[PDB]
Scaffold this active site. Structure first.
Site, short mmCIF file in Angstrom:
data_model
loop_
_atom_site.label_atom_id
_atom_site.label_comp_id
_atom_site.label_asym_id
_atom_site.label_seq_id
_atom_site.Cartn_x
_atom_site.Cartn_y
_atom_site.Cartn_z
N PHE A 196 1.95 9.83 3.51
CA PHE A 196 2.44 9.62 4.88
C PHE A 196 2.99 8.22 5.13
O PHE A 196 3.71 8.01 6.12
CB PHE A 196 1.36 9.97 5.91
CG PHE A 196 0.06 9.25 5.71
CD1 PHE A 196 -0.11 7.94 6.16
CD2 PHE A 196 -1.01 9.88 5.07
CE1 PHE A 196 -1.32 7.27 5.98
CE2 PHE A 196 -2.22 9.21 4.89
CZ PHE A 196 -2.38 7.91 5.34
N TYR A 230 0.79 -1.22 0.00
CA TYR A 230 0.00 0.00 0.00
C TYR A 230 0.83 1.28 0.00
O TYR A 230 1.99 1.29 0.40
CB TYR A 230 -0.99 0.01 1.17
CG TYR A 230 -0.38 0.27 2.53
CD1 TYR A 230 0.10 -0.78 3.32
CD2 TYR A 230 -0.29 1.57 3.04
CE1 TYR A 230 0.65 -0.55 4.57
CE2 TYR A 230 0.27 1.81 4.29
CZ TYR A 230 0.74 0.75 5.05
OH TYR A 230 1.29 0.97 6.29
N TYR A 287 -9.96 7.90 10.77
CA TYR A 287 -9.60 8.32 12.14
C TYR A 287 -10.50 9.41 12.73
O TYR A 287 -10.22 9.94 13.81
CB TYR A 287 -8.12 8.69 12.21
CG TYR A 287 -7.21 7.55 11.81
CD1 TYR A 287 -6.88 6.55 12.72
CD2 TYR A 287 -6.71 7.46 10.51
CE1 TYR A 287 -6.06 5.49 12.36
CE2 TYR A 287 -5.88 6.39 10.14
CZ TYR A 287 -5.57 5.42 11.07
OH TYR A 287 -4.76 4.37 10.70
C1 LIG Z 1 4.74 1.78 12.14
O1 LIG Z 1 3.64 1.56 11.25
C2 LIG Z 1 2.44 1.22 11.94
C3 LIG Z 1 1.22 1.54 11.08
C4 LIG Z 1 1.07 3.00 10.67
C5 LIG Z 1 0.48 3.83 11.82
C6 LIG Z 1 0.07 5.22 11.35
C7 LIG Z 1 -0.84 5.15 10.12
C8 LIG Z 1 -1.21 6.55 9.65
C9 LIG Z 1 -0.22 4.28 9.01
O2 LIG Z 1 0.91 4.96 8.45
O3 LIG Z 1 0.19 3.01 9.54
C10 LIG Z 1 -1.21 3.95 7.91
O4 LIG Z 1 -0.86 4.01 6.74
C11 LIG Z 1 -2.58 3.53 8.22
O5 LIG Z 1 -3.44 4.39 8.38
N1 LIG Z 1 -2.84 2.22 8.30
C12 LIG Z 1 -1.85 1.14 8.22
C13 LIG Z 1 -2.22 0.25 7.03
C14 LIG Z 1 -3.59 -0.36 7.29
C15 LIG Z 1 -4.63 0.74 7.47
C16 LIG Z 1 -4.25 1.79 8.52
C17 LIG Z 1 -4.53 1.29 9.92
O6 LIG Z 1 -5.64 0.86 10.23
O7 LIG Z 1 -3.45 1.33 10.90
C18 LIG Z 1 -3.74 0.89 12.22
C19 LIG Z 1 -4.23 2.07 13.08
C20 LIG Z 1 -3.17 3.16 13.21
C21 LIG Z 1 -4.73 1.68 14.47
C22 LIG Z 1 -5.87 0.66 14.53
C23 LIG Z 1 -7.12 1.15 13.79
C24 LIG Z 1 -8.26 0.14 13.94
C25 LIG Z 1 -8.62 -0.07 15.41
O8 LIG Z 1 -9.68 -1.02 15.54
C26 LIG Z 1 -7.40 -0.52 16.22
O9 LIG Z 1 -7.74 -0.56 17.60
C27 LIG Z 1 -7.00 -1.54 18.33
C28 LIG Z 1 -6.20 0.41 16.01
C29 LIG Z 1 -2.47 0.24 12.76
C30 LIG Z 1 -2.27 -1.16 12.22
O10 LIG Z 1 -2.58 -1.44 11.07
C31 LIG Z 1 -1.68 -2.20 13.13
C32 LIG Z 1 -1.09 -3.36 12.34
C33 LIG Z 1 -2.77 -2.70 14.05
C34 LIG Z 1 -2.89 -2.34 15.35
C35 LIG Z 1 -1.92 -1.39 16.00
C36 LIG Z 1 -4.03 -2.90 16.17
O11 LIG Z 1 -5.01 -3.50 15.31
C37 LIG Z 1 -3.58 -3.90 17.23
O12 LIG Z 1 -4.70 -4.13 18.09
C38 LIG Z 1 -4.33 -4.43 19.44
C39 LIG Z 1 -3.12 -5.23 16.66
O13 LIG Z 1 -3.91 -6.16 16.64
C40 LIG Z 1 -1.71 -5.42 16.15
C41 LIG Z 1 -1.68 -6.41 14.99
C42 LIG Z 1 -0.79 -5.85 17.30
C43 LIG Z 1 0.68 -5.49 17.07
C44 LIG Z 1 1.52 -5.81 18.31
C45 LIG Z 1 0.82 -4.04 16.69
C46 LIG Z 1 1.53 -3.71 15.61
C47 LIG Z 1 1.65 -2.30 15.23
C48 LIG Z 1 1.90 -2.01 13.95
C49 LIG Z 1 2.00 -0.61 13.52
C50 LIG Z 1 2.39 -0.25 12.28
C51 LIG Z 1 2.77 -1.29 11.25
#
Ligand SMILES: CO[C@H]1C[C@@H]2CC[C@@H](C)[C@@](O)(O2)C(=O)C(=O)N2CCCC[C@H]2C(=O)O[C@H]([C@H](C)C[C@@H]2CC[C@@H](O)[C@H](OC)C2)CC(=O)[C@H](C)/C=C(\C)[C@@H](O)[C@@H](OC)C(=O)[C@H](C)C[C@H](C)/C=C/C=C/C=C/1C
Length: 107
Positions: free
Chosen positions: A36, A26, A82
């Site tokens: 971003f 993506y 968001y």
């Molecule tokens: C450094 O890069 C970040 C992602 C960045 C953050 C900032 C945004 C601009 C962005 O640049 O991605 C982005 O492009 C974006 O908006 N994204 C990522 C691509 C998918 C769509 C979107 C998104 O939903 O991000 C997500 C958004 C920011 C937050 C979630 C939105 C949905 C909501 O229901 C959730 O509540 C919980 C939170 C971040 C993610 O895709 C990651 C993977 C998922 C989570 C953190 C949560 O789902 C968490 O719940 C416990 C999990 O189950 C995870 C798997 C557990 C493990 C340990 C955490 C891993 C963290 C990975 C973080 C990563 C790779």
């Protein structure tokens, strides 16, 4: 909500199931604004499990309607991204997001 516009069609038959891991590339940008994030720039596909609330609503509903091999432009309104809060330090309040998403495989 989320508008899905196909950039390249998938096989039109293989769609993700709930609880299945989607493997995607993506690029994310603010609508008519700055890029971003890009998983293509780090040369490693992004993975999430569908129907686990792991990602924003626009992605959940957008990727669900994509078949394997499909590449699409997802235009996600604030309520499906968001919202009024934004994402701290990156996405401001009431931001419409545009994602270029390619569904590479299911695992
Ligand atoms: C450094 O890069 C970040 C992602 C960045 C953050 C900032 C945004 C601009 C962005 O640049 O991605 C982005 O492009 C974006 O908006 N994204 C990522 C691509 C998918 C769509 C979107 C998104 O939903 O991000 C997500 C958004 C920011 C937050 C979630 C939105 C949905 C909501 O229901 C959730 O509540 C919980 C939170 C971040 C993610 O895709 C990651 C993977 C998922 C989570 C953190 C949560 O789902 C968490 O719940 C416990 C999990 O189950 C995870 C798997 C557990 C493990 C340990 C955490 C891993 C963290 C990975 C973080 C990563 C790779």
């Amino acid at each position: 909500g989320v508008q899905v516009e196909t950039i390249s069609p998938g096989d039109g038959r293989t769609f993700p199931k709930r609880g299945q891991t989607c493997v995607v590339h993506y690029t994310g940008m603010l609508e008519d604004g700055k890029k971003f994030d890009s998983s293509r720039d780090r040369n490693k596909p992004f993975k999430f499990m569908l129907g686990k609330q792991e990602v924003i609503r626009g992605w959940e509903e957008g990727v669900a309607q994509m078949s394997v091999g499909q590449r699409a432009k997802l235009t996600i309104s604030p309520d499906y991204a968001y919202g009024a809060t934004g994402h701290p330090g990156i996405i401001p309040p009431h931001a419409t997001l545009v994602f270029d998403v390619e569904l590479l495989k299911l695992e």
